[PDB]
Amino acid sequence: STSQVRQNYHQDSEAAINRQINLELYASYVYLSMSYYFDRDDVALKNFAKYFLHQSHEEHEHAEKLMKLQNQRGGRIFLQDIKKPDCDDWESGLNAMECALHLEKNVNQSLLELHKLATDKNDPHLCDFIETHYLNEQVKAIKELGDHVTNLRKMGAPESGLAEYLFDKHTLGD
Amino acid sequence: STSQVRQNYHQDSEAAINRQINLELYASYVYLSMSYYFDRDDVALKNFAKYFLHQSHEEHEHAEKLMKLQNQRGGRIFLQDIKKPDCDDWESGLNAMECALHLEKNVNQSLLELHKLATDKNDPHLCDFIETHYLNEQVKAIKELGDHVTNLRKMGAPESGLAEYLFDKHTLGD
Amino acid sequence: STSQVRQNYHQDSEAAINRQINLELYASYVYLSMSYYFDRDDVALKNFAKYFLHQSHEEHEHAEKLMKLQNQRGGRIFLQDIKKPDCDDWESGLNAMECALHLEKNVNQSLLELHKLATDKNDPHLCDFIETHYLNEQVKAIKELGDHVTNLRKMGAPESGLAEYLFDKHTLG
Amino acid sequence: STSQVRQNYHQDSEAAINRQINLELYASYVYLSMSYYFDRDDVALKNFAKYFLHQSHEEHEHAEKLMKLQNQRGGRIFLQDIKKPDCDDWESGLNAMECALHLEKNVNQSLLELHKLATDKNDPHLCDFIETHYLNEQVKAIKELGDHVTNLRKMGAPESGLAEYLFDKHTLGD
Amino acid sequence: STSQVRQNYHQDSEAAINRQINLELYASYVYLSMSYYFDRDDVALKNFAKYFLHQSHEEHEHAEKLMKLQNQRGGRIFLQDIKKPDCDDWESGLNAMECALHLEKNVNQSLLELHKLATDKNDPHLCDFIETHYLNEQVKAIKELGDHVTNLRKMGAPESGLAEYLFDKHTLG
Amino acid sequence: STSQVRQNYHQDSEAAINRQINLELYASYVYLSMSYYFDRDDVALKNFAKYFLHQSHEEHEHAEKLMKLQNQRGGRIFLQDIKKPDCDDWESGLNAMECALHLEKNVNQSLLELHKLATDKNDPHLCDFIETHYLNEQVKAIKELGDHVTNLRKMGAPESGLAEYLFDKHTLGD
Ligand code: NA
Ligand code: NA
Ligand code: NA
Ligand code: NA
Ligand code: NA
Ligand code: NA
Ligand code: NA
């Protein structure tokens, strides 16, 4: 049965929105895993943990806003399993940052495919939603992760534990 | 003659902007009619009246912003008659909400056709104007009107006058 | 059936109130047209536009108050088409002021005929309503528009664009 | 290798903590599903949605605190898939409240089994952790959900939509 | 090699961003020239100078935002010579306003071509960037410059120095 | 014709002021290039970028003050092309600081030649203008750039990326 509010909202866009919801929830799960990995007593980088917890919360907000959009357009939310992250151990702050960069680029690629689908279906409201709330957020996150990776590599990470300690203090601390 | 400021502004877009101006003015007229229908002593739903007056003011602001855009791009405003609404009596709060939902969906359809036209003419400024100031406003208005219709139906409207009274108090009051 | 609140409210008064509502809505439409005429890039008199937008809001408030009165007395609102203004181009600030003076005098004439009808129907509440909320408002608007036309004419409008610019700055600003 | 901080922390307690983490994340997922079910335009009970979103946040805080405890005792976090909820459609406010009551009782049962395990392993710190941060939280949640279900049934839910509307307004609103 | 952050960013978009940076810097240079032209003792219209200095600052901020975007997407900034303006003497306030209108329309045309390129490359982030930070800014600047030119012409500029004096005082002040 | 305000303002001084205007604009351009070089994701030294942006603004203020002086004395501003900087890539923070030191010494040499010309033309107002607003600014900028180069060299730059990171944090940050 069609929703009383549905208008110019293709079924493919609805399915793709559900997939994007699942993907953003998965990204939040990955970031939560990273955060509490750096909370371990044998890693002990509290600011890495805080940074990744903040990224987890940001991805969760992305997912919730996608669910709200789904309801706004008359689509129907269908949730799926949130897969566990690929790693239980993230090795180092540099490796965690590189994995976060890869994850953000994958989420951005999915969002670009979603925008392409919305464009092909002539859905300007969905295109504008994606542009306003996701595309530049992903661009900024990717640029910041690239900066962090560059600085960590230049400081001597991951071989230099002093490098990761000082980066945790001076960049991710304040 | 051509305006000294006109640039990448097609004649068809100008005419469509004038048509949209007339349509938004008509929608404001319809909402004003509804509002003062609920002000009648034999209807007496003060919060319904306030809600529809607010919707009238919003539609009028849409029309004024369209006129400002027309002047910004070097087009020329051509006003037409504002036709009276199709009904003098709106029967009930639920029926008024359903008519408002239908009207907002018609205005949204006209806005989507206008955006398709702006896209065909390669007018990205007009596309951005429509996306930023109208499309999501329509989506939110339609979602809210659907919520109102749903609650009124589930409460027992329009047969239950108690339902419309309580909805006027608890939803449209605060 | 008759409204439970209707008392001493003649049918002719009700019809005339509906006509006056349509007229006030039309006057607001005309003022809106003028306002956005002076917003054009080839006219560009911001304060003329602001003045006429304010007049448009005043006329719309008059119409809403008439609708409220109609409901207060037990009458029934019947809306009609709001006709487009007679002009799309108002030529100049002086000509727009003269057209506004003419429009306000027509609205005042309609209001005086409505007061005459209310008097013939022995409806003192309606007479007092018109006196309190419309008649002096019209007298003041007409006096102000006459002052504006006089100043614009004496300054050299409409031939002198400098005159309309300075009037836009110093009077309407 | 064994953590430098591990002391009197049994492996079974560690595995059970991981299981409890997964269960609390699952409960948060269920509550989020419920919340955005009530955000649908054909349901439109915003206070039900807010209440269930708050319960989702509560379960997520429970999960994060369990992860922090795991790291505190020298255990190692191992995350698993977060299974999708059993329902996509929650039918009614009363049925959603009943499902939430069932869910809270299941989480409480798991917490009680975990406390029994901690008692058998002579881990008084874990017993105190569970008592202080979870058991009474569950008792309060279960009591409140029972109150809500009782009021909804006595008002005439789920047949009376007026009942769910008024309960959304007067109980979950203020 | 390709930046670790580069994603869906075409080489043509990068080159066009560099060209747009050069163009915005050039527009800032032209506005600075105009501003300090009106600072001359034989012109002496301080508010024209203030207006054009503000426009120079706006165009340079546009250029800095383009450079920030270039770095955000993984492109590489390549700066070029900033050509001197076509005029050292701008003759009058009206002629300066007309030249500014022409310049803003040229910048807007380049921005529209850049947006069309971004559309052809299916780069929605760049399209949104251009729409959000440039297109409406250009539309507003062009509308305002048109208003200024219209008022200056109607007041009697450029033959009437009194017109430019009064416009400097009452509009740009 | 001669300006009504011109007095004791030689033709050579006017031409030299125009040349100095071009040179200060060129220096601002060079500093802007450096600043946005350090904004690159593969360099990522935020405080170096801020420092060089500030130096760019300082040089632009110098140029604007020269233009104001030109108009004050009755001279006529003649602008020229602002040449692009000699480098697109500044290699390192230490090399950028050394290039900035070289640039500031070149600007100072031009200012000293300009003061020599003003002295030969018996223009005490121009001498005082140069002394008050430019010469000591150049001396202070050169001293500061020398301090920065010295510290960067002593810390181990440019081979040690940790050195440039820590200098960015502790010197250019506060
Ligand atoms: Na857009
Ligand atoms: Na992100
Ligand atoms: Na609307
Ligand atoms: Na009036
Ligand atoms: Na709970
Ligand atoms: Na501009
Ligand atoms: Na300097």
Author numbering:
A (entry chain G), B (entry chain L), D (entry chain E), F (entry chain K): 4 to 177
C (entry chain D), E (entry chain B): 4 to 176
Authors' description from the paper:
As an iron storage and release self-assembling protein cage, wild-type Ftn (wt-Ftn) comprises 24 FTH1 subunits with 12 C2 axes20. With the ultimate objective to create a biocatalysis platform that could be expressed in vivo, we report the rational design of an artificial human ferritin heavy chain (FTH1)-based metalloprotein to achieve histidine-specific aza-Michael addition with α,β-unsaturated chemical moieties. Utilizing the large area the C2 interfaces cover altogether, mutated FTH1 subunits were designed to assemble only upon divalent copper binding at the C2 interfaces hosting their histidine mutations.
In the crystal structure of Ftn-1x-3 without Fe(II) or Cu(II) content, additive bending hexaethylene glycol in the C2 interface binds to MeH63 and generates another potential metal binding pocket, along with the 59SHEE63 MeHEHA67E sequence that can be found in the Ftn-L56H/R63H/E67H mutant. In a comparison to the ICP-MS data and structural models of Ftn-1x-3 and Ftn-2x-3, the E67MeH mutation displays dual roles in aromatic ring stacking and metal chelating in controlling Fe(II) and Cu(II) binding. Upon CuCl2 treatment, Cu(II) contents in the two selected variants notably increased compared with wt-Ftn, whereas there were no significant changes to their Fe(II) contents.
